[PDB]
Design an enzyme around this catalytic site. Sequence first.
Site, PDB file in Angstrom:
ATOM      1  CG  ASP A 137      -6.591   8.471   0.663  1.00 38.94           C
ATOM      2  OD1 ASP A 137      -7.031   8.880  -0.418  1.00 38.94           O
ATOM      3  OD2 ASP A 137      -5.704   7.609   0.727  1.00 38.94           O
ATOM      4  N   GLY A 149       0.817  -1.220   0.000  1.00 39.36           N
ATOM      5  CA  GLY A 149       0.000   0.000   0.000  1.00 39.36           C
ATOM      6  C   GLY A 149       0.847   1.266   0.000  1.00 39.36           C
ATOM      7  CB  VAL A 161      -1.382  -5.549   3.273  1.00 42.41           C
ATOM      8  CG1 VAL A 161      -2.478  -6.246   4.060  1.00 42.41           C
ATOM      9  CG2 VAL A 161      -1.595  -4.027   3.280  1.00 42.41           C
TER      10      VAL A 161
HETATM   11  C1  LIG Z   1      -4.118  -1.605  10.297  1.00 45.38           C
HETATM   12  C2  LIG Z   1      -4.359  -2.454   9.105  1.00 45.38           C
HETATM   13  C3  LIG Z   1      -3.842  -3.730   9.050  1.00 45.38           C
HETATM   14  C4  LIG Z   1      -4.082  -4.503   7.932  1.00 45.38           C
HETATM   15  C5  LIG Z   1      -4.827  -3.970   6.908  1.00 45.38           C
HETATM   16  O1  LIG Z   1      -5.077  -4.723   5.775  1.00 45.38           O
HETATM   17  C6  LIG Z   1      -6.243  -5.475   5.801  1.00 45.38           C
HETATM   18  C7  LIG Z   1      -7.126  -5.448   6.856  1.00 45.38           C
HETATM   19  C8  LIG Z   1      -8.247  -6.242   6.770  1.00 45.38           C
HETATM   20  N1  LIG Z   1      -8.532  -7.032   5.728  1.00 45.38           N
HETATM   21  C9  LIG Z   1      -7.663  -7.032   4.712  1.00 45.38           C
HETATM   22  N2  LIG Z   1      -7.998  -7.854   3.651  1.00 45.38           N
HETATM   23  C10 LIG Z   1      -7.615  -7.761   2.294  1.00 45.38           C
HETATM   24  C11 LIG Z   1      -7.612  -8.916   1.543  1.00 45.38           C
HETATM   25  C12 LIG Z   1      -7.255  -8.883   0.214  1.00 45.38           C
HETATM   26  C13 LIG Z   1      -6.896  -7.688  -0.374  1.00 45.38           C
HETATM   27  S1  LIG Z   1      -6.441  -7.697  -2.105  1.00 45.38           S
HETATM   28  N3  LIG Z   1      -7.077  -6.576  -2.771  1.00 45.38           N
HETATM   29  O2  LIG Z   1      -5.008  -7.481  -2.183  1.00 45.38           O
HETATM   30  O3  LIG Z   1      -7.106  -8.904  -2.553  1.00 45.38           O
HETATM   31  C14 LIG Z   1      -6.890  -6.526   0.357  1.00 45.38           C
HETATM   32  C15 LIG Z   1      -7.255  -6.568   1.687  1.00 45.38           C
HETATM   33  C16 LIG Z   1      -6.510  -6.273   4.713  1.00 45.38           C
HETATM   34  C17 LIG Z   1      -5.312  -2.683   7.011  1.00 45.38           C
HETATM   35  C18 LIG Z   1      -6.123  -2.081   5.901  1.00 45.38           C
HETATM   36  N4  LIG Z   1      -5.082  -1.942   8.103  1.00 45.38           N
END
Ligand SMILES: Cc1ccc(Oc2ccnc(Nc3ccc(S(N)(=O)=O)cc3)c2)c(C)n1
Length: 299
Positions: free
Chosen positions: A136, A17, A22
Amino acid sequence: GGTIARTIVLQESIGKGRFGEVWRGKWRGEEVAVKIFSSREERSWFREAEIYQTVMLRHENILGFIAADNKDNGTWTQLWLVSDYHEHGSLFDYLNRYTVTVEGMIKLALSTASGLAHLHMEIVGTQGKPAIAHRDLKSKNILVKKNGTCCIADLGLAVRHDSATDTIDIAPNHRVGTKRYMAPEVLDDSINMKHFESFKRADIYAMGLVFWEIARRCSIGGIHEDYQLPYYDLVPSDPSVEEMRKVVCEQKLRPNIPNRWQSCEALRVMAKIMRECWYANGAARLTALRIKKTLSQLS
Ligand SMILES: Cc1ccc(Oc2ccnc(Nc3ccc(S(N)(=O)=O)cc3)c2)c(C)n1
């Protein structure tokens, strides 16, 4: 020893990101999501941890935060944000993958508006929550739960209002968000950053564009539109502030609202909401509360 990152096993890379890589991981048998930052990203890691630890933030339409933590692998230190894991990924991924019923569209728009209403709402008291503006908001910063509701995530760029002294908790920098979703007053720098209501108004413009994204995929009788980001018809991918500003502020265009949508009551209520988020004058826009009530009455 530590009780968080120490006992988490990473399983799957989700992607890089803006700040934070992530991962999907496992914490005492349970799936969790982990944002990993390097030591040179300490400021962004800390700020996002700070926001997520705001008193009384927890709400079913905001991402459920577990902990900030450090992890030393023996060569370098990693800065971790751990959260609940949502298998469907972002509202962007879900809208690309799927079409939705009228029931589904209303769940996604309602849950999103309820999340924003909670963020925006000041709660009085010592445990009282300060009003918060995201800065955002976009389909990629909203996640989709298994029950078909949204939660707002990626709160790193958020600002918090101290209502006692009328001060915002950081010294805000112009145009930090995603360029495509910036409100007109952000695109042309006319926004008054010494007024907290101005930040809530920019969020509402962005949410309107997101509702548009959702409404396009609501399939009634086989008819629906393909997934597009807002302004797909008017600006390139990775548009500049100047490109956005010429379209949103000089030509005064907004995403197109198809004829098809006046046929249906739900799309008609949604269409009316979009227009009432897209006013060039932030003051005329709907509040997230008012939008939550409307979609509650519609549902
Ligand atoms: C603080 C924090 C930790 C982890 C995080 O990332 C996450 C949190 C919860 N669920 C997800 N799931 C997720 C699954 C797949 C994809 S993708 N688009 O790459 O398939 C993106 C997010 C990510 C975020 C946004 N914030």
